[PDB]
RNA sequence: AUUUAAAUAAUAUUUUAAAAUUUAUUGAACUGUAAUGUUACAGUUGUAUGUACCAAAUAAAUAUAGUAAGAUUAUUUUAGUUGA
């Protein structure tokens, strides 16, 4: 992030960085996502019970 | 009518403490005694063999009933009590203490003159008691310590069953006709969520605040009508 | 003001005593040589109103 | 003991309006707490003093048919829930039709 | 209502004027507001400075059986003005004490008395009635005790 | 801890803007001091005004009269 | 912080060195009890710092 | 001669005390109303109360009953909320404030100190030196009593009279001093000596703020707990021995099936002056609570166990619900509104009272009904003051019109007319509540759901193939979408229509329904 | 967040911090009363806090006892 | 309060221009109604329009002119960095 990069750059100028931009800031490929909408906050408990 | 006040001593001579005192009588009888005085105890006898003794007891009872509760009420640091003893006697007396525990209490007898009215006898007894209290206070040793004890002492007039008639129940109501400069900023400072709002509502002054758009609309509608 | 402009006061006007803060801190402070230290230390004034 | 309570020995600095300001308000003739106002200047002090009466009658004195001894129309001011704005409203006395009987006339008026 | 609406109706501005105001104002709001020129803060009130004989004549015309304690200080909402010796000046609180100060300056004996009587010791009368509830608080003994 | 020099400069500027032509005039103080409070009374026009001289408002209130009424 | 609430004792400094220098120069008479009025009249202090 | 007329100094009739000015201002500032004195009960009212009958049977808690008594601001409510522990209804905290008589009505709750489970009762503080009849009834019902007193206020003739009354009734009482943290050792000696000389015995010190004495209090109650357990087991043995009579056999059946089943939480809600307190008094058969013409008569929830037609339940009365407009000005009534909402959120059935004298339910009444529907509790509507309303037919038509105009499942809410004073249709109301709970817990068949969905699809986005009822208590149906696009859910209109179809077909009339849009994966 | 609590956040913190009692949290043997005082500053502050208030009951009891002793 | 300065002086702050809004007032000779050319009804508004710009007309005003834009009067000069 901005904070980390600025702190490291301004304090340890000779700091090496090991990053793979292609897979950085992304979830793994073996992860599935499900964004469930709820009509109201009350339905969230029922949705959680259903998932369990 | 009044609850929470301490119950007065139930002695046979302490009828004044039990009886309700109209505020008018207390205002009429205002007696100031040296605050170094601590306690006043009038002691008289139920029955007296001699006629002079009976007169002395009568004047002592009258003095108690008249100027005993007022002294306590108007001093707030003097404990005044009256007691009738089931015993023959002709020399009622008064015991005066002081805030100096090392000061011997003083005893003032009742010595009626040959012939005088009850009012004059009571006034003379009150004058003698006041002079004795003043002398005792002046003779007290370590006046600085006496004043510290006075500061630390509670109020002894809390058992008085006063009856405010038209002056007002609260001190503010009773002193409404006077300006009180002896205020405390911490006590006067309102402590509520919107103290400025409530103060402006109480006293109808706008803190240089603009009028309301609803008021403007209503005024324009009325002007149209 | 009276000390700085005595010209305007031909007579010694009654001088009010300072406030409680002044009495505690300066006027009645032996360390500061407060001018009311003697008066505060006196005892007859506590003894009787006459004194 | 608890550190969230002011120590009895400690004395916090005075913060509220001073005795001078409270005395000014009292001399003007208002309660001490009346010193708590959003803003105040010379004109506002004059306005809130009360020496000047900001009231009126529905009709001029030579036209007011009703008997108003000392009652006059007065506008009361109330701040909103937020102290930002204020609304004012006029208030009138309680007019009761006095149906009296006069001994001289012997008939109800 | 124009005043409620905060409408600037002024004759020199728009030729209008509110109908609830007064046509003549003896002293403007600033003049009313300035209190130091209205009350006895520091300003002197009686400009006349009489001589010893004139002060003696004033005291002579003062009737007997009169005490300074019988003239209460007028409230703050009353003009603090000191008329001359025009009439019963002793009734006027400010003129009375101004003459008192003039007599003090001139060395003229002041027989009327003091505004307040300090009661140093406990003497007769021992019981007094004060339905105004001010004498007990103003008593010198009470003040002395509180100070101590 | 000292505030940021940028914000301090901004605030000192807001204090300076009172009198800009006079470069010799030092910036106004954050809290008024004795000299600043007394200069106004020291001026001649206020030198004649005895009611506002020598910290009249700063000093505690005067004792009110034995009898005081507001009606 | 450092609020000048009414009644606060905020004294203006008076350098003892300044007073001694005034005495040495001769603007203040040692034979008299020095007071703020004497200092003002001798002009060792200005009206700006008399609050 | 020369004197000025006596006259007030402060102008405008104001007061130099902002507290006096505040009390003059009133409601917006002092939200808490003063103590409620005992109501004036007429002889006719007493006769009618005696003539009343209990439509439900109130159950005497088998656990030891301990009641806390004393004057106002004695720490009784603080001690009660320290001892109490509700595992099933979180947020049940009795209102505690520095005012006098904050507790309006008696409350009861299960409490435990050191593994000893009992039921503790809080009662209103003494007012006018005469405890209210509800307080007397609760104290008499309670097995033991703790008389709690403060040290910042000397004992009073009211406390002396209460102690004498307890002695006359032979109530085992233990004396507690609840504000010993405000007093010092030298003063502690004197106050404890006075309490000992009172006559009861060594007064147990205690401090609610410090939570000190709880361990010591438990030791004092343990003998009572043990003897109460012995008495309970003796009674059980007697019932077993005498079961041949038949009434005792039925009692044993009740005491077995109550453990074999679970209570149903019936919560009565409404506006300030609806009459819920009167309704619960009629249901229980006497005036367990107190009903007064004052708007906010009671400030804390009350729970009463009872069995109706052999089905355990806990009838709950709430303080009342107020609109946000009023609550914002008076947060305190906002506090009691929040307390009531907390219990509504945990109730198993909700019954909303609205005064029929108004002629029809209010917009806020419909708001409360929608709120309970969203929470997911079987909601019922009851029109009170039916014996007082004039145009019964017009009122019924207005109620039906409002119900029909309601849009969500509230449109299926059933309205019943009930009168407290007369006691009309109370049995019908209880029967409807039980039926609503049964519908709430009802189950549906997957094959039936699938056939119903197929018929609906043929009769009237991404379709669905599987519909099943996942949850039981609140009926929730899971519908699976034949699409992998996670945002291609069903329209809200379509889902509302599906819910209405389910309500119409499976008789979930007064029961809310929930749907879950699921996508394959 | 609390709507109408009798205790503000500071009051709740004070009440929870004052629940601590060294007497129950530790032991104290008789010999230590003459050579050690773990609760010196905190106990002095607690006693001062108690002194801040004035209990009518205890004051009246003490006054009555003193009156009885005087005779 | 161990412990170094100083020339107490204030008033000013481009310019043109916001769909503006506010206050007060007039207009039914045009137009739109009712009445039988005339009368009555008008800007929190009368019946698309209300006198050849309907967010009308007349009079007053210099609104956060700012996060619109434009203009802005004195050649021959005399010192640091051109994307941080
Ligand atoms: N110092 C101290 N104060 C307490 C203690 N317990 C309660 N209080 C105070 O006493 C006040 C009274 O609150 P409660 O005791 O809850 O009120 P209540 O018991 O229901 O009494 P009523 O409202 O009259 O029915 C509270 O506001 C607390 O501040 C205690 O243990 N120590
Ligand atoms: N005539 C009549 N009045 C009723 C009936 N039921 C309730 N009430 C009214 O309810 C009032 C009593 O108030 P409560 O019963 O305590 O109801 P509440 O005002 O909501 O009190 P709380 O619910 O405890 O806050 C009485 O004055 C009646 O007017 C009824 O069946 N008939």
Q: SS3 for E52-116, per residue?
A: HHHHHHHHHHCCCCCCHHHCCCCCCCCCCCCCCCCCCHHHCHHHHHHHHHHHHHHCCCCCCCCCC
Q: Rounded to an integer, what distance in angstroms lies between the CA atom of residue C23 and that of residue C32?
A: 11
CA distances from A51 to A48, H474, H476 (A): 5, 16, 13
Chain breaks after residues in chain B, where C lies over 2.5 Å from next N: none
Question: By CA distance, what is F71's nearest residue in D?
Answer: D29
Question: By CA distance, what is B134's nearest residue in C?
Answer: C48
Interacting residues of C18 by C-beta distance below 8 A, sequence separation 6+: C26, C27
Mutation for C interface: F46, F57, F60, most C CBs within 10 A: F60
CB contact under 8 A, C1 and F53: yes
Per-residue 3-state assignment (H helix, E strand, C coil) for chain D: CCCCCCCCCCCCCCCCCCHHHHHHHHHHCCCHHHHCCCCCCHHHHHHHHCCCCCCECCCCCCCCCCCCCCCCEEEEEEECCCCCCEEEEEECCCCCCCCCECCCCCCEC
Cβ contacts of F66 on chain E, cutoff 8 Å: 73, 115-116, 138
Of H174, H211, H216, nearest to H196 (Cα)?
H174
Q: Nearest nucleotide (C1') to the CA of residue B225?
A: J44
Question: By CA distance, what is C3's nearest residue in F?
Answer: F54
Q: Rounded to an integer, what distance in angstroms lies between the CA atom of residue B43 and that of residue B31?
A: 20
Q: Rounded to an integer, what distance in angstroms lies between the CA atom of residue D65 and that of residue H200?
A: 76
Question: Within 10 Å of residue H164's Cβ, how many Cβ atoms?
Answer: 11
C-alpha of residue H122 to centroid of ligand 1, in Å = 13
Element (H, E) at B83: strand B79-88
Which bound ligand lies closest to the C-alpha atom of H293?
2
C-alpha of residue H41 to centroid of ligand 2, in Å = 14
* Number of the ligand 1 atom closest to the C-alpha atom of H72: 24
F44 — phi, psi (to 5°)? -60, -50
DSSP E strands in H133-249: the ranges are: 144-149, 173-177, 204-205
Interacting residues of H270 by C-beta distance below 8 A, sequence separation 6+: H276, H318, H320, H321, H352, H353, H354, H365, H368, H384
What is the number of CB-based contacts under 8 A between chain B and chain H?
Answer: 38
Of H292, H269, H502, nearest to H384 (Cα)?
H269
B87 — phi, psi (to 5°)? -165, 140
Residue nearest to nucleotide J1 (CA to C1'): G13
How far is C-alpha E86 from the chain's CA centre? Answer: 17
CB contact under 8 A, D8 and I42: no
Of H130, H106, H104, H100, nearest to H120 (Cα)?
H106
C-alpha of residue H81 to centroid of ligand 1, in Å = 11
Cβ contacts of D45 on chain E, cutoff 8 Å: 33
Exposed / middle / buried, residue H140 (Cβ in 10 Å: 0-12, 13-18, 19+): exposed
D98 — phi, psi (to 5°)? -75, 110
Per DSSP, the three-state class of C32 is coil
DSSP class of residue G49 equals G
CA distances from H142 to B199, H60, H170 (A): 49, 10, 12
Relative orientation angle of helices H185-198 and I56-70, to the nearest 10 degrees:
80
Q: Rounded to an integer, what distance in angstroms lies between the CA atom of residue H121 and that of residue H134?
A: 12
Mutation for C interface: B33, B37, B144, most C CBs within 10 A: B144
DSSP class of residue B8 equals P
Q: Rounded to an integer, what distance in angstroms lies between the CA atom of residue H297 and that of residue H105?
A: 9
CB contact under 8 A, H3 and E132: no
Pocket test for ligand 2, best of H33, H134, H273, H289 (most atoms within 8 A of CB): H273
Q: Nearest nucleotide (C1') to the CA of residue G49?
A: J8
Two tokens, residue H8: 């007030």
Cβ pair E112, E62 in contact under 8 A: yes
Nearest CA to ligand 2 atom 20: H273
Q: Is the CB of H276 under 6 A from ligand 2?
A: yes
Q: Rounded to an integer, what distance in angstroms lies between the CA atom of residue H384 and that of residue H353?
A: 6
Two tokens, residue H503: 């309500």
Cβ pair D44, B208 in contact under 8 A: yes
Question: By CA distance, what is E142's nearest residue in B?
Answer: B32
Which bound ligand lies closest to the C-alpha atom of H104?
1
Which bound ligand lies closest to the C-alpha atom of H214?
1
Exposed / middle / buried, residue H513 (Cβ in 10 Å: 0-12, 13-18, 19+): buried
Exposed / middle / buried, residue I67 (Cβ in 10 Å: 0-12, 13-18, 19+): middle
Which bound ligand lies closest to the C-alpha atom of H382?
2
List all chains that touch chain G, counting a touch as 3 or more CB pairs closer than 8 Å: C, D, F
Two tokens, residue G5: 């609430």
The DSSP result for F5-71, as a single string, is: HHHHHHHHHHHHTTS-S-TTSPPPPSS--HHHHHHHHHSHHHHS-GGGSSSTTTSPPPPPPSS----
CA distances from D68 to D62, D64, D71, D98, G18 (A): 12, 8, 6, 12, 74
CA distances from D22 to D32, H224, I43 (A): 6, 62, 39
DSSP class of residue B209 equals P
DSSP class of residue F61 equals P
Cβ pair I22, D7 in contact under 8 A: no
Chain breaks after residues in chain D, where C lies over 2.5 Å from next N: none
Question: Within 10 Å of residue H419's Cβ, how many Cβ atoms?
Answer: 22
Element (H, E) at E140: helix E140-147
**Pick from C10, C11, C49: CB nearest E140:** C49
Pocket test for ligand 2, best of H44, H48, H275 (most atoms within 8 A of CB): H275
Q: Rounded to an integer, what distance in angstroms lies between the CA atom of residue H372 and that of residue H492?
A: 20
Q: Rounded to an integer, what distance in angstroms lies between the CA atom of residue I8 and that of residue F63?
A: 40
**Pick from D31, D50, D81: CB nearest H15:** D31
Cβ contacts of B72 on chain I, cutoff 8 Å: none
Q: Nearest nucleotide (C1') to the CA of residue E2?
A: J23
Nearest CA to ligand 1 atom 23: H102
Residues with CB under 7 A from strand J: B 216-217, 220-221, 223-224; E 2, 5, 7, 14, 16; F 17-22, 24-26, 35-36, 39-40, 43; G 11, 13, 15, 17, 48
Interacting residues of I35 by C-beta distance below 8 A, sequence separation 6+: none
* Number of the ligand 1 atom closest to the C-alpha atom of H96: 16
**Pick from D52, D54, D75: CB nearest E32:** D52
CB contact under 8 A, C50 and E104: no
Q: Rounded to an integer, what distance in angstroms lies between the CA atom of residue H81 and that of residue H208?
A: 10
Question: Within 10 Å of residue E138's Cβ, how many Cβ atoms?
Answer: 12
Q: Which residues line ligand 1 (CB under 6 A)?
A: H 72-78, 96-98, 100-103, 124-125, 178-179, 181-182, 207-209; I 6
How far is C-alpha H252 from the chain's CA centre? Answer: 29
Q: Rounded to an integer, what distance in angstroms lies between the CA atom of residue A45 and that of residue H476?
A: 11
Task: Describe the strand order of the beta sheet including B106-109 as a list of residue ranges.
Answer: B79-88, B37-47, B93-98, B106-109
Distance E14 CA to J25 C1' (A): 12
Q: Rounded to an integer, what distance in angstroms lies between the CA atom of residue H132 and that of residue H191?
A: 29
DSSP class of residue H179 equals B
Question: Within 10 Å of residue H445's Cβ, how many Cβ atoms?
Answer: 12
CA distances from B10 to B66, H178, H379 (A): 18, 30, 64
Per DSSP, the three-state class of B198 is helix
C-alpha of residue H185 to centroid of ligand 2, in Å = 50
Q: Rounded to an integer, what distance in angstroms lies between the CA atom of residue H213 and that of residue E1?
A: 67
Q: Is the CB of H293 under 6 A from ligand 2?
A: yes
Was H57 annotated as part of a binding site? no
Per DSSP, the three-state class of H36 is coil
Q: Rounded to an integer, what distance in angstroms lies between the CA atom of residue H477 and that of residue H499?
A: 9
Q: Nearest nucleotide (C1') to the CA of residue B217?
A: J44
Cβ pair H264, H311 in contact under 8 A: yes
Pairing of strands H302-307, H264-270: unpaired
Task: Describe the strand order of the beta sheet including H117-122 as a list of residue ranges.
Answer: H107-112, H117-122, H65-69, H144-149, H173-177, H204-205
**Buried b vs exposed e over H203-234: b needs ≥16 C-beta within 10 Å?**
bbbbbbbebbbeeebbebbeebbeebeeeeee
Pairing of strands H107-112, H204-205: unpaired
Distance G51 CA to J7 C1' (A): 24
Q: How far is H375 from chain A (nearest CA, A)?
A: 6
Resolved by: cryo-EM
Two tokens, residue H227: 């003897």
Q: Rounded to an integer, what distance in angstroms lies between the CA atom of residue C10 and that of residue E42?
A: 15
Q: Where are the alpha helices (DSSP H) in H406-471?
A: 426-440, 446-459
Q: Is the CB of H358 under 6 A from ligand 2?
A: no
* Number of the ligand 1 atom closest to the C-alpha atom of H182: 1
Interacting residues of H157 by C-beta distance below 8 A, sequence separation 6+: H129
* Bases of chain J with protein Cβ within 7 A: 1, 4-13, 23-24, 43-45, 60
Cβ pair B83, B43 in contact under 8 A: yes
CB contact under 8 A, F38 and G10: no
Nearest CA to ligand 2 atom 10: H275
C-alpha of residue H209 to centroid of ligand 1, in Å = 9
Per DSSP, the three-state class of B40 is strand
């Amino acid at each position: 992030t901005r904070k980390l990069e600025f702190v490291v750059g301004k304090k340890y100028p000779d700091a090496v960085t090991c990053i793979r931009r292609q897979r950085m800031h992304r979830p793994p490929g073996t992860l599935r996502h499900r964004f469930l909408p709820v009509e109201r906050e009350r339905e969230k408990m029922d949705t959680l019970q259903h998932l369990l | 009518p009044f609850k929470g006040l301490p119950k007065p001593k139930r002695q046979f001579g302490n009828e004044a403490a039990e009886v309700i005192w109209p505020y008018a009588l207390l205002l009429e009888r205002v007696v100031k005694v040296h605050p170094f005085t601590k306690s006043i105890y009038v002691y008289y006898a139920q029955r007296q063999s001699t006629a002079r003794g009976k007169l002395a007891a009568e004047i002592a009872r009258s003095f108690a009933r008249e100027f005993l509760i007022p002294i306590t009420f108007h001093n707030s640091q003097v404990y005044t009590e009256a007691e009738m003893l089931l015993e023959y006697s002709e020399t009622p007396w008064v015991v005066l203490h002081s805030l100096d525990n090392g000061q011997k209490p003083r005893i003032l007898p009742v010595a009626p003159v040959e012939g005088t009215p009850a009012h004059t006898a009571v006034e003379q007894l009150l004058a003698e008691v006041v002079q004795g209290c003043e002398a005792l206070g002046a003779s007290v040793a370590d006046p600085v310590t006496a004043t510290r004890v006075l500061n630390e002492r509670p109020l002894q007039n809390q058992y008085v069953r006063v009856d405010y008639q038209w002056f007002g129940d609260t001190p503010d109501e009773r002193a409404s006709h006077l300006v009180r400069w002896e205020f405390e900023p911490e006590q006067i400072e309102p402590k509520i969520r919107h103290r400025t709002r409530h103060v402006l509502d109480w006293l109808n002054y706008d803190g240089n605040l603009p009028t309301h758009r609803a008021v403007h609309v209503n005024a324009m509608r009325e002007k149209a009508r | 003001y009276q000390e700085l402009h005595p010209e305007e006061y031909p007579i010694f006007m009654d001088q009010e005593l300072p406030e409680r803060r002044g009495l505690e801190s300066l006027a009645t402070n032996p360390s500061k040589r407060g001018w009311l230290t003697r008066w505060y230390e006196d005892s007859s004034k506590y003894a009787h109103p006459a004194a | 003991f608890s550190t969230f309570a002011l120590n009895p020995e400690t004395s916090v600095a005075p913060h509220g309006p001073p005795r001078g300001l409270v005395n000014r308000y009292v001399s003007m003739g208002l309660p001490p707490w009346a010193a708590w106002c959003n803003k105040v200047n010379r004109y506002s002090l004059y306005r809130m003093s009360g020496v000047t009466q900001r009231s009126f009658l529905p009709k001029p004195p030579q036209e007011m048919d009703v008997i108003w001894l000392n009652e006059r129309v007065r506008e009361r001011v109330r701040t909103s829930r937020q102290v930002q704005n204020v609304y004012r409203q006029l208030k009138y006395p309680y007019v009761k039709t006095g149906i009296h009987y006069s001994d001289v006339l012997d008939h109800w008026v | 209502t124009p005043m409620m609406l905060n409408i600037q109706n002024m004759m020199w501005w728009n030729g209008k004027r509110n109908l609830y105001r007064a046509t003549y104002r003896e002293k403007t709001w600033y003049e009313i507001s300035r209190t130091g020129a209205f009350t006895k803060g520091r300003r002197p009130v009686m400009r006349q400075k009489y001589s010893r004989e004139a002060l003696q004549a004033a005291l002579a015309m003062v009737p007997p059986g009169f005490e300074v304690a019988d003239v209460p200080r007028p409230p703050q909402r009353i003009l603090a003005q000191s008329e001359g010796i025009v009439g019963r000046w002793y009734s006027n609180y400010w003129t009375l004490h101004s003459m008192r100060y003039q007599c003090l300056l001139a060395g003229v004996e002041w027989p009327l008395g003091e505004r307040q009587r300090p009661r140093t010791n406990y003497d007769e009368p021992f019981f007094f009635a004060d339905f105004e509830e001010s004498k007990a608080r103003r008593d010198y003994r009470s003040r002395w005790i509180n100070v101590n | 801890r000292p505030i940021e020099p940028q914000y301090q400069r901004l605030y000192m500027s807001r204090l300076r803007i009172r009198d800009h032509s006079n470069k010799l005039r030092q910036p106004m103080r954050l809290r008024a001091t004795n000299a600043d409070i007394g200069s106004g009374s020291s001026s001649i026009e206020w030198e004649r005004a005895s009611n506002r001289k020598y910290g009249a408002m700063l000093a505690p209130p005067k004792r009110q009269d034995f009898e005081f009424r507001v009606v | 912080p450092r609020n000048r609430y009414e009644g606060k004792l905020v004294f203006s400094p008076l350098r003892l060195s300044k007073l001694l220098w005034a005495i040495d120069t001769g603007r203040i008479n040692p034979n008299e009890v020095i007071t703020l009025y004497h200092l003002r009249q001798a002009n060792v202090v200005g009206e700006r710092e008399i609050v | 001669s020369f004197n000025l007329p006596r006259e007030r100094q402060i102008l405008g009739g104001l007061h130099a005390d902002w507290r006096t000015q505040m009390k003059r201002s009133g409601s917006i500032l002092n939200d808490i109303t003063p103590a409620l004195p005992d109501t004036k009960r007429t002889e006719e009212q007493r006769r009618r109360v005696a003539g009343w009958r209990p439509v439900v049977k109130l159950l005497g808690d088998q656990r030891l009953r301990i009641a806390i008594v004393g004057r106002m601001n004695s720490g009784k409510s603080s001690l009660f909320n320290l001892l109490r522990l509700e595992p099933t209804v979180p947020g049940r905290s009795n209102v505690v404030r520095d005012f006098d008589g904050i507790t309006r009505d008696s409350v009861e709750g299960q409490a435990q100190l050191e593994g000893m489970h009992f039921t503790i009762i809080d009662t209103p503080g003494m007012v006018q030196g005469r405890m209210v009849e509800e307080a007397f009834r609760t104290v008499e019902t309670a097995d033991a009593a703790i008389f709690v007193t403060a040290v910042d206020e000397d004992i009073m003739p009211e406390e002396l009279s209460l102690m004498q009354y307890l002695h006359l009734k032979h109530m085992p009482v233990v004396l507690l001093a609840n504000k010993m943290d405000l007093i010092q050792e030298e003063e502690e000696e004197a106050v404890l000596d006075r309490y000992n000389s009172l006559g009861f015995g060594n007064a147990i010190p205690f401090s609610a703020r410090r939570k000190s004495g709880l361990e010591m209090l438990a030791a004092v109650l343990e003998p009572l707990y043990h003897i109460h357990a012995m008495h309970k087991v003796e009674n059980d043995w007697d019932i077993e021995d005498l079961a041949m009579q038949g009434d005792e056999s039925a009692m044993e059946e009740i005491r077995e099936r109550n453990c074999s089943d679970r209570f149903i939480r019936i919560a009565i809600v409404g506006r300030t002056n609806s009459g819920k307190s009167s309704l619960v008094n009629r249901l229980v058969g006497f005036e367990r609570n107190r009903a007064v013409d004052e708007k906010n008569s009671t400030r804390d929830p009350v729970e009463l166990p009872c069995s109706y037609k052999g089905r355990k339940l806990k009838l709950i009365d709430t303080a009342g619900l107020a609109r946000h407009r009023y609550r914002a000005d008076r947060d305190f009534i906002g506090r009691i509104h929040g307390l009531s909402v907390n219990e509504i959120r945990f109730a198993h059935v909700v019954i909303v009272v609205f005064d029929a004298t108004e002629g029809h339910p209010n917009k806020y009444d419909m708001a409360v009904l929608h709120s309970v529907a969203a929470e997911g509790r079987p909601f019922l509507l009851c029109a009170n003051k039916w014996d007082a309303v004039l145009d019964q037919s017009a009122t019924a038509e207005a109620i039906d019109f409002k119900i029909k105009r309601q849009v969500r499942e509230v449109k299926y809410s059933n309205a019943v007319v009930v009168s407290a004073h007369t006691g009309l249709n109370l049995t019908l109301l209880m029967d409807q509540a039980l039926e609503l709970y049964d519908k709430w817990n009802k189950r549906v068949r997957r094959a039936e759901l699938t056939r119903l969905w197929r018929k609906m699809e043929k009769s009237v986005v991404a379709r669905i193939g599987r519909i099943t009822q996942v949850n039981t208590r609140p009926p929730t149906f899971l519908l699976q979408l034949q699409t992998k696009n996670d945002s291609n859910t069903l329209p809200k209109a379509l889902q509302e229509m599906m819910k209405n179809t389910l309500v119409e077909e499976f008789d979930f009339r007064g029961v809310p329904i929930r749907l879950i849009q699921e996508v394959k994966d | 967040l609390k709507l109408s609590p009798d205790r503000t956040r500071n009051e709740e913190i004070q009440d929870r911090q004052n629940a601590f009692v060294w007497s129950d949290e530790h032991i104290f043997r008789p010999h230590q009363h003459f050579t050690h005082d773990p609760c010196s500053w905190s106990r002095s502050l607690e006693q001062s806090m108690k002194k801040q208030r004035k209990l009518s009951m205890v004051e009246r009891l003490r006054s009555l006892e003193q009156r009885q002793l005087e005779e």
